[PDB]
């Protein structure tokens, strides 16, 4: 059985450095939040960037932190007019017994606006 971990972080500009540095922060905080020791606990990781972020692949930042054998996938997020701009969303598929109520999901920077509940 698998438990998904959700994550969202916002960048101030569409620069590769910005995108890479922010996805590293989110990815690690997500793992830290759930006390995931090994990357082997990850079935795969899916990413979604907003339409206003095209300068870099977030998957390249996961490899910077050494997630080589972790399967990665990124896609374009729905361009809802008036939605929070420049948002990198993460869905990590984690192999765990952990209850739904016990998974910790990370919303960083202005992305806190996304889940205040």
């Amino acid at each position: 059985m698998v438990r998904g971990i959700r994550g969202a972080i916002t960048v101030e500009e569409d620069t590769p450095a910005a995108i890479l540095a922010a996805t590293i922060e989110l990815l690690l905080k997500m793992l830290e939040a759930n006390g995931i020791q090994s990357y082997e606990e990850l079935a795969a990781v899916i990413f979604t960037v907003t339409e206003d972020l095209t300068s870099a692949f977030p998957a390249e930042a996961a490899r910077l932190i050494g997630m080589h054998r972790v399967p990665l996938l990124s896609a374009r997020e729905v361009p809802v007019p008036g939605s929070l701009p420049r948002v990198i969303r993460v869905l990590a598929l984690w192999n765990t017994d952990t209850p739904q109520d016990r998974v910790r999901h990370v919303y960083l920077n202005e992305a806190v606006r996304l889940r205040p509940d």
Partner: protein, 109 residues
């Protein structure tokens, strides 16, 4: 005696405010605003990233203490980056220009 002070600011408004005050107040001769910085640093034992701007302040050892205070007053950060780099040698004329335009003066009772 003449030195290049580095100041990292969070925004263009902060950059322009701090930049103008320093020159306008005779605390520095020139300020260069280098935009689009991506800053990686330690914040509460966790490595975090932020978007900033770099100020290259053309000043002198004399102006530095007041500059330090003034920048602190105008900067939104609790601990702002105010670091002076020494000018080893330079364009004689330029350094003069720097001396003409940098200096907050004294009172001899």
């Amino acid at each position: 005696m003449e030195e290049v002070v580095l100041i990292t600011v969070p925004s263009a408004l902060v950059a322009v405010k701090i930049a103008h005050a320093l020159v306008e107040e005779r605390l520095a001769a020139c300020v260069n605003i280098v935009p689009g910085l991506t800053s990686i640093y330690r914040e509460e034992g966790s490595v975090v990233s932020d978007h900033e701007l770099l100020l290259l302040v053309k000043t002198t050892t004399d102006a530095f203490p007041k500059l330090k205070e003034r920048v602190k007053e105008l900067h939104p950060y609790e601990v702002p980056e105010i670091v002076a780099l020494p000018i080893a040698e330079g364009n004689r004329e330029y350094l003069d220009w720097l001396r003409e335009n940098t200096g907050l003066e004294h009172h001899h009772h």
